Write a protein that binds this ligand. Structure first.
Ligand SMILES: O=C(CN1CCCCC1)NN1c2ccccc2Sc2ccccc21
Ligand SMILES: [Ca+2]
Ligand SMILES: [Ca+2]
Ligand SMILES: [Ca+2]
Length: 183
């Protein structure tokens, strides 16, 4: 296809932008096409991949949130180049890069701020995936513990987190990014 072949121009950009060698990129492409012969990974295809890893819960919500960050050009598919860029950051990136990636995940509406509600959303999604837990203390729910973490990161108390607040906030309390395995 136009999307099934790995073109040199794609490799050039990927070796410029990522932590992968040309050899690794070519190897990854073989694996990408095995899982995705069309060269394009759909949202539901992405969800199915997560269901293989968390058969107990429902990883649908979390996978959809992650999908949007992989799909950086917002055309509704993950192409190989997008897959590799995201893999590079999340598996080989430095702390600042990983934190920025996590910020993009939490900023669901891409308005440049994380709200409490956005943070609730991701946390809920994670619990749906790995297993929800009953709380008998209304003062000690996930939302309330998140509120405390949020409040501590929200340095000017405007009820929203900038990238700088989240990134610096997470270096002192890495729990929101460790929750994505990015700390
Ligand atoms: O590990 C990531 C990126 N994750 C890390 C933290 C959660 C949010 C971003 N990619 N990924 C991944 C990780 C876990 C489950 C499914 C996937 S699909 C996939 C297919 C081939 C190689 C890597 C990946
Ligand atoms: Ca895309
Ligand atoms: Ca937002
Ligand atoms: Ca703020």
């Amino acid at each position: 296809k136009k999307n099934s072949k790995l073109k040199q121009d794609t490799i050039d950009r990927l070796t410029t932008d990522t932590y992968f060698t040309e050899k690794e990129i070519r190897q990854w492409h073989k694996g990408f096409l095995k899982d995705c012969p069309n060269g394009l990974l759909t949202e539901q295809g992405f969800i199915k991949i997560y269901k293989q890893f968390f058969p107990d819960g429902d990883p649908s919500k979390f996978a959809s949130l992650v999908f949007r960050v992989f799909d950086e050009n917002n055309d509704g598919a993950i192409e190989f180049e997008e897959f590799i860029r995201a893999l590079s950051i999340t598996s080989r990136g430095n702390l600042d890069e990983k934190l920025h990636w996590a910020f993009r995940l939490y900023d669901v509406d891409n308005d440049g701020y994380i709200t409490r509600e956005e943070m609730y959303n991701i946390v809920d999604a994670i619990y749906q995936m790995v297993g929800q837990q009953p709380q008998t203390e209304d003062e000690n729910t996930p939302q309330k513990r998140v509120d405390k973490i949020f409040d501590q990161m929200d340095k000017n108390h405007d009820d929203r987190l900038t990238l700088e607040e989240f990134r610096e906030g997470s270096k002192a309390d890495p729990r929101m990014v460790q929750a994505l395995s990015l700390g």
